[PDB]
Design a protein around this ligand. Structure first.
Ligand SMILES: *[C@@H]1O[C@H](CO)[C@@H](O[C@@H]2O[C@H](CO)[C@@H](O[C@@H]3O[C@H](CO)[C@@H](O[C@@H]4O[C@H](CO)[C@@H](O)[C@H](O)[C@H]4NC(C)=O)[C@H](O)[C@H]3NC(C)=O)[C@H](O)[C@H]2NC(C)=O)[C@H](O)[C@H]1NC(C)=O
Ligand SMILES: *[C@@H]1O[C@H](CO)[C@@H](O[C@@H]2O[C@H](CO)[C@@H](O[C@@H]3O[C@H](CO)[C@@H](O)[C@H](O)[C@H]3NC(C)=O)[C@H](O)[C@H]2NC(C)=O)[C@H](O)[C@H]1NC(C)=O
Ligand SMILES: *[C@@H]1O[C@H](CO)[C@@H](O[C@@H]2O[C@H](CO)[C@@H](O)[C@H](O)[C@H]2NC(C)=O)[C@H](O)[C@H]1NC(C)=O
Ligand SMILES: *[C@@H]1O[C@H](CO)[C@@H](O[C@@H]2O[C@H](CO)[C@@H](O)[C@H](O)[C@H]2NC(C)=O)[C@H](O)[C@H]1NC(C)=O
Ligand SMILES: *[C@@H]1O[C@H](CO)[C@@H](O[C@@H]2O[C@H](CO)[C@@H](O)[C@H](O)[C@H]2NC(C)=O)[C@H](O)[C@H]1NC(C)=O
Ligand SMILES: CC(=O)N[C@@H]1[C@@H](O)[C@H](O)[C@@H](CO)O[C@H]1O
Ligand SMILES: *[C@@H]1O[C@H](CO)[C@@H](O)[C@H](O)[C@H]1NC(C)=O
Ligand SMILES: [Ca+2]
Ligand SMILES: [Ca+2]
Lengths: 48, 948, 96, 48
């Protein structure tokens, strides 16, 4: 519940509930768009 | 410092040097003789306030009854035609033919009209058919629209029929519940288009009754992010569906329920209050847990207040959340067991929470459930709550078919300030046997007919009155339907800080100067009772610079058909008026020959008031071709006047001879005077004449007599009036114009006071200065001020260069002290219809605060010492007799090197008054007495979920 | 850190304002070599935060190291290559 | 540029997006000698 910072769009690869967290972890494991999730994780704690 | 006796004798030598020059050069006494030496070319007719009030209020009622008959004739036919519809679901072959507005097709054929330009219509129109408007977000050619697009085509015949009976008829529009608006006569629609007929103020007031809304906003933790931006926008668009008869308040709950603003209870939800609520809603944040039990208890308590004014009508709680698992059954059981309060619930945002409890809350309390997942659904889903509120209105039957009139608002089709009649249209299919009753509880639409304010100003003629007399009409809410100070501009709120859909609701106490006696007159006029009262009022001038006090008489009666109240403002010396009686030909030919532009060499440069002396003769608003048009009209036209009237033509022609006898027999004798630069006469007929034709190009006053600020100001005063020129090189006004002096002519025909005209001169500033000195002394200052603290001369040259300027902007220290010693009184006002440059966060509407100064005490001799600290300045003040001037002598400002902040008397951009403490003591108002809610036949069996 | 430091900081805003022109902003040329934002009325000047909100840049050792690690995993390295093509010229960044 | 695009696809960056972008219904730059009238012609079904 920390990806609600954009206020203009909804994020699909989040950690909201357990199935979504599992799907996000699997997606990062496959490597596809892992940097996109990392950017959201960084911006959720402030930013650069 | 000279003694008091020396100064007073010094004044009397110069005071009489101005009155005598103005009394002889202008010729105020001679015009008295001219107006008294005939007493046969006119007649003094009584001006009864009680009769005019009751006559003009009967013509206004008849005008609104013509439109009421037009609405009934349209609403009945629409119900009959629609009841005979078959709901065909294919239009490929039987294509519907219609004219679509804002255009250069499955089952539609477009129409190319002729669009002949017409008067009394600022656009091109066509009476052959009726135009159809379909909003951008609604697809034309759909099954619902196309079916709606047949049975409305039978309305075109009735549209034509209503216009034939009354040619002076404005837009007649049908706002369908589907979204399309069909109006007559057809005219092309006026960036992108966002117009929706179902959000207009005239549609909203007729689709339901006044409501006591209360918006509950979920500001818990889970609503943070995108789904809060959707909630804040949804509340803002929801507040736009409320009018002055609706009472609303906004509260938010997150483990604790509190108001989002300073109101703490229901407010009238006008433009001022809605702005405060909108600003506070846009400043909420999401944090905490959700508590529906505490949130709904807070909302149910605010609807049971009854301490303050409410609508005493539809009570609805409108919940803005996302989703939860709490149903709060005990709260609904405890508070509304008998279902007196409706609950509408909204599920906003892209989420996956439980909508079960939200849906259950909706229809357990006779409400409806809505989905707002994105921005595109905000516009449509926040206006559909009126369908539920309209259920008791349709079940009432023919007792709910009452014509209502909206507030004054600017027309969508660029027509000006208009009001709209309103009448709903019902679904009565199958009612002959009463078997369907399922979709028959929703209105088909709303009937509308527009009445312009120009049509109402025509039924109240003001040209038999003095320029200080006028009519004004009031709303039960207190707003003015008619007023001279009402302007075709939207009313603003606050300062526009940037990095016309609202109605023009101007209150009576805000249109003019507020007084403790106006309030009781306003209350007596709101509740509809006739009366009259004569009392002393202090009146703001036409230009917001001077305040003058004079007697006024207010006479009011209620308009019987409607809920409006009409009042006539009429001062003293205006109970009689000059009516010209003269029909001979050769006595009018000589008068008309005076208005020839080629005769201005000896008769002075002559103006003419752009009045509708005679239909044909149109107005040009330039007074260059209009005079040529007018004088070439009178000779090339039979004197019998088959169409227009001669009362407005005899009066102007009679005063043409009266002013001719003055410019010829007295002004020509004294061709040039050392101290006189121009000579002007302004009459009630509507002509102004300046003898020096070379000085006729310096005339900046309005050609219409009734709009001249100095003319109205001169009538109230019994002495000469000095008008200071404008500042900041606003045209030629510094040295080549002069200082305007005016004096009203007073005649006594049979002992009855009349003021038909004013006369005066333009004193040249250059020649008056020498008389003032008989110079630039470094010890003492000699300045002259008028009634209002505007500089007219000084004794330091540099001060003279800045002429016609407020004395507080050139010497703040002395001006501020003058107010404290009670020589200059002042009241501030608020100008809600004003435009100003935006500030840091073109031009936009804003509220500007206006202040004017006037002589408070009647004493004439003033003396005192101005102490500015570690120094001392002594002054003496003497007011000139028979004049609104004051002379004050003070030492130079360089003797005491102190300079406080300059005192500004100008259009100051403000945001007051503060509305947080206005709602504590709101103005008296009366609401509609008809309420339609809580009908036992209401179905309400579709909550929000049986369809999803 | 040596080849290019602080070069992704120039996108094209509107004329005499602080609003970016395009929806997906990209850097201009650092000094008249790479991308030139040519619209009706536009100019580009320093003041931009960065392509990915400031996360993707070589203007710090930590930022450069993170971007290098991201590029090695073959995930979103062409984006950085294109941003250098826009900011710097066109023949140097392809070698790196 | 073609070799760089092929290397990008070899590393597997957005190769399916490029394949979609190389479909028949695509406009052609105003520099090729193409018959007047039909601009949206270049692009072939052989991209897949
Ligand atoms: C005034 O009230 C009358 C009745 O009180 C109302 O006339 C009724 O109109 C509805 C249409 O809204 C007719 O409904 C018929 O039955 C269904 C209901 O939609 C339609 O079949 C499909 O229904 C689905 C919804 O589930 C819909 O999406 C689809 O488009 C429909 N059509 C298909 C699949 O082809 C029928 O098409 C529809 N029409 C028929 C059968 O002709 C009622 O039958 C009408 N009732 C009467 C007594 O005429 C009228 O519209 C109201 N006035 C206005 C302005 O709306
Ligand atoms: C909805 O649109 C329909 C298609 O335009 C209208 O249906 C047609 O209206 C015509 C005009 O009245 C009819 O033409 C004549 O109708 C009279 C009356 O019954 C008869 O003389 C004939 O039926 C016909 N005359 C001819 C063909 O010479 C059509 O009959 C009628 N039906 C069709 C074309 O199938 C509806 O009237 C319209 N609904 C409303 C409420 O206006
Ligand atoms: C509005 O209607 C009322 C009555 O419905 C009118 O009251 C009249 O008042 C006069 C006194 O001024 C009485 O002589 C009449 O008898 C009253 N009328 C009736 C029907 O009794 C009132 O004048 C009407 N107002 C207007 C402006 O027409
Ligand atoms: C006004 O509202 C208050 C509270 O909502 C009502 O309650 C009374 O308020 C007055 C003054 O505060 C006091 O009599 C008591 O504190 C309250 N209770 C009772 C039983 O009076 C009040 O009734 C409302 N109306 C008025 C006229 O005050
Ligand atoms: C407009 O006129 C003056 C402007 O200062 C004010 O009227 C006086 O207000 C003071 C304030 O208490 C009173 O003591 C005086 O008795 C008032 N003078 C009167 C009533 O003649 C006030 O601001 C305005 N007057 C109104 C609103 O009636
Ligand atoms: C004190 C004052 O108002 N001075 C005015 C100045 O504001 C204005 O800009 C100028 C224009 O010529 O004329 C002078
Ligand atoms: C309309 O109003 C006028 C005056 O307001 C009145 O004479 C007339 O009878 C009314 N009705 C019609 C149909 O003109
Ligand atoms: Ca919650
Ligand atoms: Ca990849």
């Amino acid at each position: 519940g920390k990806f609600n910072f954009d206020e203009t769009q909804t994020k699909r690869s989040t950690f909201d509930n357990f199935p979504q967290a599992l799907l996000t972890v699997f997606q990062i494991l496959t490597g596809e768009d892992w940097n996109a999730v990392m950017y959201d994780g960084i911006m959720a704690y402030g930013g650069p | 410092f000279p003694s008091a006796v020396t100064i007073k004798s010094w004044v009397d030598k110069m005071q009489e040097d101005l009155v005598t020059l103005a009394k002889t050069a202008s010729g105020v006494n001679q015009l008295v003789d001219i107006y008294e030496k005939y007493q046969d070319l006119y007649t003094v007719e009584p001006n009864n306030a009680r009769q005019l009030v009751e006559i003009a209020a009967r013509d206004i009622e008849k005008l609104l009854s013509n439109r009421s008959k037009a609405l009934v004739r349209l609403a009945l036919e629409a119900e009959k035609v629609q009841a005979a519809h078959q709901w065909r679901e294919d239009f490929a072959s039987n294509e519907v033919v219609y004219y679509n507005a804002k255009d250069d097709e499955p089952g539609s054929q477009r129409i190319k009209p002729v669009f002949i330009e017409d008067a009394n219509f600022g656009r091109q129109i066509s009476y052959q058919h009726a135009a159809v408007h379909i909003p951008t977000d609604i697809y034309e050619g759909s099954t619902i629209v196309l079916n709606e697009l047949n049975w409305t085509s039978a309305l075109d015949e009735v549209f034509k029929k209503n216009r034939e009976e009354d040619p002076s008829l404005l837009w007649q529009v049908f706002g369908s519940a589907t979204g399309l608006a069909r109006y007559y006569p057809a005219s092309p629609w006026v960036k992108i288009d966002l117009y929706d007929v179902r959000r207009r103020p005239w549609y909203i007031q007729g689709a339901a009754s006044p409501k006591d809304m209360l918006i509950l906003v979920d500001v818990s933790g889970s609503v943070s992010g995108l789904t809060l931006k959707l909630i804040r926008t949804s509340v803002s668009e929801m507040l736009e569906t409320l009018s002055d008869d609706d009472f609303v308040n906004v509260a938010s709950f997150n483990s604790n329920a509190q108001d989002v603003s300073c109101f703490q209870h229901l407010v009238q939800a006008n433009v001022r209050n809605k702005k405060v609520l909108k600003d506070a809603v846009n400043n909420i944040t999401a944090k905490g847990i959700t508590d529906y039990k505490k949130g709904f208890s807070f909302a149910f308590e605010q609807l049971l207040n009854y301490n303050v004014s409410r609508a005493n009508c539809n009570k609805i709680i409108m919940l803005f959340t996302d989703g939860g698992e709490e149903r709060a059954q005990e709260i609904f059981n405890k508070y509304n067991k008998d279902k007196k309060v409706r609950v509408f619930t909204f599920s906003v945002g892209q989420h996956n929470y439980d909508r079960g409890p939200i849906q259950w809350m909706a229809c357990e309390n006779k409400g409806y459930y809505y989905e707002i997942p994105s921005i595109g659904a905000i516009r449509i889903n926040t206006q559909e709550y009126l369908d539920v509120l309209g259920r008791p209105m349709v079940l009432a039957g023919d007792k709910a078919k009452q014509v209502q009139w909206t507030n004054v608002y600017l027309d969508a089709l660029e027509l000006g300030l208009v009001i709209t009649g309103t009448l709903p249209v019902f679904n009565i299919t199958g009612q002959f046997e009463n078997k369907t009753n399922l979709k028959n509880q929703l209105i088909l639409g709303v009937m509308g007919v527009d009445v312009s304010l120009e049509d109402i100003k025509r039924l109240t003629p003001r040209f038999t009155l003095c320029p200080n007399g006028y009519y004004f009409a009031i709303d039960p809410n207190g707003y003015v339907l008619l007023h001279p100070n009402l302007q075709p501009k939207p009313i603003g709120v606050g300062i526009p800080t940037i990095n016309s859909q609202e109605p023009v609701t101007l209150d009576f106490l805000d249109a003019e100067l507020e007084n403790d006696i106006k309030v009781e007159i306003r209350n007596k006029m709101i509740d509809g009772e006739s009366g009259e009262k004569t009392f002393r009022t202090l009146v703001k001038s036409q230009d917001e610079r001077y305040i003058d006090k004079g007697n006024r008489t207010y006479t009011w009666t209620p308009v019987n058909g409607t809920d409006y109240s009409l009042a006539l403002v009429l001062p003293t010396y205006s109970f009689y008026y000059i009516k010209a009686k003269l029909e001979e030909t050769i006595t009018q030919a000589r008068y008309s020959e005076t208005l020839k532009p080629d005769n201005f060499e000896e008769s002075g440069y002559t103006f003419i008031a752009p009045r509708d002396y005679c239909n044909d003769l149109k107005i040009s608003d330039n007074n260059t071709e209009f005079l040529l048009n007018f004088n070439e009209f009178i000779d090339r036209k039979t004197p019998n006047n088959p169409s227009c009237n001669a009362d407005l033509i005899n009066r102007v022609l009679l005063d043409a001879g009266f002013t001719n006898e003055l410019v010829q027999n007295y002004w020509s004798k004294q061709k040039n005077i050392k101290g006189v630069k121009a000579r002007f006469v302004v009459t009630d007929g509507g002509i102004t004449r300046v003898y020096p034709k070379e000085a006729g190009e310096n005339w900046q006053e309005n050609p219409e007599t009734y709009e001249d600020s100095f003319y109205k100001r001169s009538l109230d005063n019994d002495n000469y009036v000095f008008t200071a020129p404008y500042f900041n090189k606003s045209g030629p006004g510094a040295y080549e114009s002069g200082i305007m002096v005016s004096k009203a002519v007073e005649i006594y025909i049979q002992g009855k006071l009349l003021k038909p005209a004013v006369v005066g001169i333009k004193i040249d500033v250059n020649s008056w200065i020498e008389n003032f000195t008989k110079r630039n002394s470094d010890v003492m200052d000699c300045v002259i001020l008028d009634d209002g603290g505007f500089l007219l001369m000084a004794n330091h040259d540099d001060y003279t260069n800045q002429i016609g300027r407020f004395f507080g902007e050139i010497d703040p220290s002395l001006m501020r002290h003058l107010v404290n010693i009670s020589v200059y009184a002042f009241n501030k006002s608020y100008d809600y219809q004003s435009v100003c440059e935006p500030g840091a966060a073109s031009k936009q509407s804003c509220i500007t605060e206006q202040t004017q100064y006037f002589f408070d005490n009647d004493s004439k001799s003033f003396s005192g010492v101005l102490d500015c600290g570690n120094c001392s300045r002594i002054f003496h003040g003497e007011k000139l007799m028979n004049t609104n001037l004051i002379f004050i002598m003070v030492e130079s400002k360089g003797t005491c090197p102190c300079d406080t902040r300059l005192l500004i008397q100008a259009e100051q951009t403000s945001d007051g008054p503060n509305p947080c403490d206005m709602v504590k003591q709101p103005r008296y108002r009366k609401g509609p007495d008809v309420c339609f809610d809580n009908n036992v036949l209401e179905d309400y069996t579709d909550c929000g979920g049986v369809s999803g | 850190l040596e080849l290019f430091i602080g070069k992704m900081h120039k996108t094209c805003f509107f004329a005499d304002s602080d609003i970016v022109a395009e929806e997906d902003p990209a850097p201009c040329a650092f000094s008249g070599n790479g991308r030139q934002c040519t619209a009706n009325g536009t100019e580009c000047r320093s003041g931009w935060v960065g392509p990915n909100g400031g996360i993707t840049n070589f203007d710090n050792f930590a930022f450069a190291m993170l971007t290098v690690f991201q590029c090695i995993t073959m995930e979103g390295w062409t984006d950085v290559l294109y941003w250098m093509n826009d900011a710097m010229g066109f023949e140097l960044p392809w070698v790196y | 540029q073609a070799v760089l695009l092929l290397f990008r696809c070899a590393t597997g960056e957005a190769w399916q997006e490029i394949m979609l972008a190389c479909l028949p219904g695509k406009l052609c730059d105003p520099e090729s000698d193409y018959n007047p009238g039909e601009e949206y012609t270049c692009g072939s079904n052989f991209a897949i």
